[PDB]
Every structure is written in C-alpha cells, then in structure tokens.
Amino acid sequence: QDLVPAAVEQAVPIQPVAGAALAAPAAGQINQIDPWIFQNFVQCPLGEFSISPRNTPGEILFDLALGPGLNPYLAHLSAMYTGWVGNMEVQLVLAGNAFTAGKVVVALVPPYFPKGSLTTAQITCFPHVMCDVRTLEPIQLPLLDVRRVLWHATQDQEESMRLVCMLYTPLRTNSPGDESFVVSGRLLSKPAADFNFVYLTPPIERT
Amino acid sequence: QDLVPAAVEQAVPIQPVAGAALAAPAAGQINQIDPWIFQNFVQCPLGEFSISPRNTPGEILFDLALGPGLNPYLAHLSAMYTGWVGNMEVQLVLAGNAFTAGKVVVALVPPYFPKGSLTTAQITCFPHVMCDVRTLEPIQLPLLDVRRVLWHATQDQEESMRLVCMLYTPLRTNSPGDESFVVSGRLLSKPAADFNFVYLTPPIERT
C-alpha cells in the first residue's frame, strides 16, 4: 500500500555543476567575494517588466543571462576582474490582485540552444516553474552554470545559461476598469554557493 | 481519547502496479530512458482546455489516456521502440481569479470500463481528486498502469487507464464583465518511477 499526495511544492531539481573546481588550474587566481553578498537577493539591474491584457500567450516577458551583470554588487566587482565562473540564484515577484487571472512559465534555457522562437508547447520542456499572476510571495530558481569552457570572461559577453519568462495563459480579468492594470514584475538575484571571480585586475571602471 | 483533524491533503492512495517486472521475460529487451525525463513535468501535447460559464455540470473537459503520447519526450522516443509499459504522473493547472466559483473532479477511470456517459454522481466513485477553479498551484495525480496484458504496443493504440475531468459544480461568477472569462486549463505529465520502452527499433519517424 502507498499514498501519493495531490499538492507538492515546485522545487526544480538540479545536478550540481562545478564552479571554481574546474577553472582552478587554468586560472591565475580564484578570488573570493564578500560572504554577505550570498546572503540576500537584490533587484537585477534589468529586472523590470510588466504584463498586460494586451499580451498574447507566447510573448517573452524577459530573457536574462547568467553573469555578474544580474547583481549590482557582482556588477561592481566585475571591474576589478577579467572573468567569472559559478552559479547564481534568481527570484521573481509579481503585483496582481485577485481579479487578474493568468499563468507564466519561467524556464532555464541552456546555452547553445538555438536562439529563435519558443512556443508555449516548448517552454515547459525545459526545467521550469509555473507561476500564476496572483502569487504574493517571491518565487526563486537556481541559475546554474552549464558551460563547456572552464570560466567565462567578464568583458567579452560569453554565452551562458539564460532564463526566460513566457506568458503561458492569456492574462485576463473580469470587467472592472481594466486594460489599464499592467501587472508589474521584478527580478532579484544573488550569487549561489559556488560563485567567484577569476583574476584580480586594476578597476577599469569602464565596462 | 483521540483527535481527528478537519482539513487534510488530497493524496489519492494507490497500490503499486508492476511495470517492467511483468513484461521482462516476454519482451526481447527492456530499454531505459534518460533519467532526467523523470525529473520534471512538461505540457502534454493535448493538455489544453477551457472551462466556461456556458458549460453544464457533467460535461467532460478532457479525457486523456495513459501512454507515451502524454509526454513530448516519450512521444519522441516512441519512434525507436515497438511498445511500452509502466506508470506516469500527470498534473493540472488552472487560471482563475477570485471571482470564478466552481469545482471539477479529476478521476482515474480504469481500462475496460464501459466508455459511455458519466454522471456527476458517478465521477466521484473512481479514485479522484476535487479541484476548485480558484486554485493557484498545480495538482498532480498518479496515472497507474492497470492492465491485463504484459506490455502495450506503441503503434497499436492499446486500451489503458484513462484520466477524465468533469465539471462537478457549475462554473459561475458574480456579475462583472463575464461570459467572456474562459478559465484556461493545462496538463503536464512525466513518466513515473517504473516506465520504460520494450524493444529497440529503427526510428520510423512516422507514427
């Protein structure tokens, strides 16, 4: 006998990817960061968007890319280093009342996947999480570092794992004053447990 | 003395059915699949429907059937094999605001049950789960493999356990702009812990 539940958490599963352990011998240095940067999220420099009843399902709300540019602290430290390697952790927040119905999908698109058009039927094929616009609490995901190079360079804009958000179900409400109720959405990020820069360097302050 | 609670999870109970353990001696092979296919749901190729205030209670919203056709990964691997056996796991998501009231029932209709008309009084007789249209999180169910044959054939459209969704309680709202508020609904699926194909075969790509 057994008993299967009918409601479980989302909890995207992963297989741990190595950070500095791969880039160690081929890098001149391995530079730590302030251990408190791992300790809270912070709004990504571009983590801003807004859903609207005039968005068709399938539209990509945002498409971020793993890197130190997702965290204003890492973005500031990146001026003193030539490259980076490791994982990060993102979270999303929405602003919707009980009148807005609709669901979006946040998926972890890997690198080297053909950058083209994604259908709603495809977006769920990736490791993902489904979030409806009525949620109050933030929703987090691990941005791993699937890569075939030992460590990326900061200033060269390497290709890494992306994170895409698609409007799964058409956002629609009842008929109060609507079509003027953009659901705002924000993104915050913080380095995962295995993030660190690669080579100390004069702060060039121009990146 | 004792104390019985008043609110528990749904958690449909099961008795484990054997997968490859039955089909082992009478099959030429037993082919594994990528162990990561077990690790996330993905929208069923036909997992799309929509409830409307113009649906009478009793209407069947969808009726799926156990098989590799519920998962685009299994559906793709099925071209290299002649048959399959095992269990799967489905989940359902809805898109409703706080104004839509109504409940549906998801039941596991067994094979060889007379394919006819099901009343609302009957739908709850099966192992089922009750879901109201206001739910935010997905709701999952185990699609077991009740069968009297050792293993089904992929290309012959065998008869297996179905999964039916009936509008239990009439979906109705208050009176904002309504009758134009179809509650979208989607289905995702993934192989259970005991799924595998039966016989390697040139990929015929035409199924």
Add this chain to the structure above:
Amino acid sequence: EQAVPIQPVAGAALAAPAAGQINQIDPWIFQNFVQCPLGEFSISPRNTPGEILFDLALGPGLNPYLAHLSAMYTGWVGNMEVQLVLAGNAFTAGKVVVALVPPYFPKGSLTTAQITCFPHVMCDVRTLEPIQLPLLDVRRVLWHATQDQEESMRLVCMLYTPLRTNSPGDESFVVSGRLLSKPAADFNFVYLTPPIERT
C-alpha cells in the same frame, strides 16, 4: 554467430499457471530441420540491394509436423530455431542481412539501412555452414491460441550488398538460399482438443 542483442524469452514456463495442460511433442521432431514453407530465394547479379528475400513469422505453420499437431490443441507457446543455407562458390561476393523484427511493427518498405537497426546478422554469400539463429516468441499474451494467427516475431531477409560474380552465356548464376526450422527446447502446445474437421 548466434549472438544477437536479445534477451532470453521465456516460453511455456510463463504460460503454465494459466494453461489447463502443457502438452509435449514427439522428441524426434526436435531433431530434424524442415524446410519452411516460403523460406527460399535466389539472388541474381541484377537484383538490387534492399529487396526482401523472405519474410516469415513465428508460429506452428512453419513446420508441417507442428502445423499438423496444431489441429489437436487450443493454444501454443515457445520459441523456434532456424538456419539459412546459401549456395555460392568462392568466386562470389555480396552480403545478406537477416533481422528479427518485433511482433508489432508498421508494415511497409525497409531501406537497406533500417534493416540493420534490428537485432540482426550479416552474412556473406561465401559461407559454407548453415547460419543458425533463434526465433523467440516475443508477446504480450501468455500463450498464443492456435485457431487465430496473431502478431508474432518475424524473420526478414534483405539483400544487403549486391552480387558480384561472373557467369557463362547461361544462366547468370543465381545464388540460391533456403531456410529450415525446427522447434526450440521449450515449444509446447496448451490444451488437448478434439480436432475439428476444418482446421
């Protein structure tokens, strides 16, 4: 050469608990390869590769003695053992592939490439000894019923690589092949039954 990527298929040890009886066969029948009813072909130098030389499914109809015994029982189950013979001297060249298609497969054309994807063997036309290989009873039911031909595992023989020989003014020197079969160690009939007249 009897090494194909296949598992041992249980027969008559899987159908025993649900069969009323398990009837045996005259053991002499186990010791004589008999010509299958359509297990014969003849390759010509102009036969294009990819052709189907023979195709035949497992069942009691592959053996005259087994076909005669089938009229006396209700069901049958078990494997068989076949061998291919080719008539070619040392001055030939060309290959023939023999595959084991599963007992559920969309019928139609098979290119010379797909035929290799099954558990198969490749055979040169210069092989003296008969090529032996098993015919296992892959199935979903326990034991097949004698009075209705259901899907069973089939042998398919495809001309893989064309024939390269000289030939005199006549008659182009075909390479003829034949196929013989016999019951395996655990081929049995199920339920003794009065032999109905039109079987």
Add this chain to the structure above:
Amino acid sequence: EASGQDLVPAAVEQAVPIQPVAGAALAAPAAGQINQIDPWIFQNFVQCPLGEFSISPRNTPGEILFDLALGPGLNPYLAHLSAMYTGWVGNMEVQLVLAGNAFTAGKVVVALVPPYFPKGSLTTAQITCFPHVMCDVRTLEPIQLPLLDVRRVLWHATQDQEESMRLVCMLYTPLRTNSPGDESFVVSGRLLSKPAADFNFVYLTPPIERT
C-alpha cells in the same frame, strides 16, 4: 566466387598511434542534469546514415571515398536522440565493410584527420601523414576502428558546427579486376557505427520537429 581463403582477412587493427580520449567524464560536472542513453544502443552496430559508397575501376587514386565527421549524425539512434538534447561528448566505433570479389585488387587508406585541419584537398601525398590504416578491398571481416573526440572544449553543441576529428577514407591504389571476361566488379563498401564506452548527450531540450 568461392568460399576459399584466397582473400586477405586483414581484420588486424594496426595500432593507430593515438592515446585514449576521455569522453563524457569531462562534461559531467558541467551539465546541470544527469543524462544517459539506452544501453541497448551500445550493443549492435548499425549502418551509418551516409554509410554506403562504391569503388569503381575508373576511380582515380586520391578520390575521397568518404569523409565523415564525429558526431551524433553517425547513428540513426544517435541522430534521432540528438534532437532532444543540446550537446554531446564521447567517441565512436566504426566498422568498414569492404568484402570485394576475389578477382579484384586495390588498396584504400583511412585516416583520422584532427580538428581544425583545413578541409578540402587532402591529397594522396599527405593522407598517410595522419594516424591511418591501409586496407585491401578484398578484406573479409569488417574493419573496426575508433573515432575519438579530440576536442578543445568540454563538449560539442548538438548543433554540430563545431570542429570534430573527422574520419576520411581515400582511394590509394586504382581498383582493378582479374577475371577474364568483359567485367570489372565495382565493389560496394558499407559503414556501420555505434557509440563508444562513454558517448553521451548533456542537457534535455524540446525535441524540435525539423531537426
């Protein structure tokens, strides 16, 4: 024309001067998932998609009989699986079937040209400069030979624009026959393949339709 041993059953694998090459073991700690292909695929050889070719007595020494690059496009199974993932690692094992008639004669050469080598000419003067084998068109047994993943990065994207150690078989000596009558046996050569010990893909993706 007969079953005799007047042929060259040179199934001998001359020691190809090349070290072993690590496969998926290098990309495992860099892939976010755990992936694995059907073990039965590792069992039997199968004709490569473009696995057929033919040698005519009018072919000139130096003509490329075939030139095929390492990747999932060498097995129907692997090619079908490659539509589900994004990236692949590992080596391959290839059998060459050259069992021409006993009245024929001629030799070809198979070489493991490394990546980043300029494609194109590959003249007969330099085909032997690579780790190679010399094969006779009258060989009975299939000639086994490895296809290692000599690479610069961890894995190759399943979109195989990458550079992989391609394998090239070139006609070395002209094909000539010896039978007394008005006919030169054109020999039909085949190519079978199967994944090596630790060939593997990396990251699951939606199985695109038009691969």
